[PDB]
Amino acid sequence: SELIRVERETGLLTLRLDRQDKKNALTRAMYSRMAEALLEAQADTAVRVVLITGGDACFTSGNDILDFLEQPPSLRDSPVGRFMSALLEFPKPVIAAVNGPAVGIGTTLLLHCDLVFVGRNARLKMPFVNLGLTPEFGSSLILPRMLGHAKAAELLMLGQDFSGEQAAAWGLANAALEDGATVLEHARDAARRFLHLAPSAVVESKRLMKAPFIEELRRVIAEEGDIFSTRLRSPEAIEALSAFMHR
Numbered sequence: 001s002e003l004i005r006v007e008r009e010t011g012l013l014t015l016r017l018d019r020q021d022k023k024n025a026l027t028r029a030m031y032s033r034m035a036e037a038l039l040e041a042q043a044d045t046a047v048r049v050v051l052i053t054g055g056d057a058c059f060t061s062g063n064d065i066l067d068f069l070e071q072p073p074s075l076r077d078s079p080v081g082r083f084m085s086a087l088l089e090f091p092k093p094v095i096a097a098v099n100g101p102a103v104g105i106g107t108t109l110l111l112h113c114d115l116v117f118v119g120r121n122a123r124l125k126m127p128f129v130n131l132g133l134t135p136e137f138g139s140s141l142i143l144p145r146m147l148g149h150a151k152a153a154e155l156l157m158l159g160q161d162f163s164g165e166q167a168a169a170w171g172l173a174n175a176a177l178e179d180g181a182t183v184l185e186h187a188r189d190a191a192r193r194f195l196h197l198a199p200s201a202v203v204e205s206k207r208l209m210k211a212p213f214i215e216e217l218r219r220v221i222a223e224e225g226d227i228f229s230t231r232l233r234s235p236e237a238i239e240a241l242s243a244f245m246h247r
């Protein structure tokens, strides 16, 4: 139980990425632990809210690239695919607390959280195109809808990174805060606010908010994943990926 810590407090389940030497790069075993932690907590009436964080300095550099190179996953049927499906379908409040880098799925998973808090100077990007890859986790749908095409394109067709401050201005984050522990403390207070509300009013509000979009999102995630899986096995991406290793 070495790389994903699962602190079960009062009504609040905390998934804490703990792989600091690798900038919390997500392995198949981390995705698997998070997918099952979500799916259990989903059924655990004791659990009211989930918090996701990498701690005070780092959120996640995204997918482990070695994993991408050695064993290209089919996104649907894979640990990453099961993590994506689990978070997407998670019916209770999910809160992210982000410091430092949030890269690739480090940013896109935030598009499925109910509240997102970031350090002002966190570093967010979607470097898919830089790596011969394409958008993932429904970001090709969510981001143009939220931001319009041109602004989304800056993030997805150019892979432009952006600060936590900028994430809050655009509404990807709910607030940009003092970097470090403050981000987590404020996220914990938001979780405590949810504890004061009727569990089913919250849960049902969240379902109504996703209902008009979820079928299209399910279908977009499937198209993206087929493109992404194919590209991982093509030379363009293999070259860019092993180039990042051996930088």
Ligand SMILES: CC(C)(COP(=O)(O)OP(=O)(O)OC[C@H]1O[C@@H](n2cnc3c(N)ncnc32)[C@H](O)[C@@H]1OP(=O)(O)O)[C@@H](O)C(=O)NCCC(=O)NCCS
Pocket (backbone or CB within 6 Å): 021, 022, 023, 025, 026, 060, 061, 062, 063, 064, 065, 066, 101, 103, 104, 105, 127, 128, 131, 133, 244, 245
């Ligand atoms: C997040 C990032 C900007 C931080 O950069 P940094 O401060 O220079 O720290 P490093 O890049 O040197 O990372 C430190 C170590 O973690 C490793 N690492 C970091 N991210 C990794 C990743 N996604 N996959 C595999 N290893 C990773 C480095 O290879 C390095 O390993 P080593 O110390 O054993 O040699 C940079 O690590 C990065 O760009 N990582 C990959 C981001 C990415 O492309 N994710 C996938 C998108 S599909």
